[PDB]
């Protein structure tokens, strides 16, 4: 059980890093779509 808890903690730390990378991809998509709108309008 102690080894299982260690593995869960390591897995959840790594999962949190994967979610941060997806969050950062989302920030780039906001910049992309804002750029499309600015081109269409200007």
């Amino acid at each position: 059980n102690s080894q299982a808890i260690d593995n869960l903690r390591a897995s959840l730390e790594t999962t949190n890093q994967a979610i941060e990378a997806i969050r950062q991809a989302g920030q780039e998509m906001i910049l992309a779509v804002q750029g499309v709108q600015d081109y269409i309008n200007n």
Partner: protein
């Protein structure tokens, strides 16, 4: 910036790279759980 053609390609490529990094981290997380 050039106002001639639309270019959001650098944002899209950065998003692709971040999604690839996420996929590798999810593989690492599942490998740790499987052990």
């Amino acid at each position: 910036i050039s106002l001639e053609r639309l270019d959001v390609g650098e944002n899209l490529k950065k998003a692709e790279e971040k999604l690839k990094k996420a996929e590798e981290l999810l593989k690492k997380s599942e490998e740790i759980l499987k052990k």
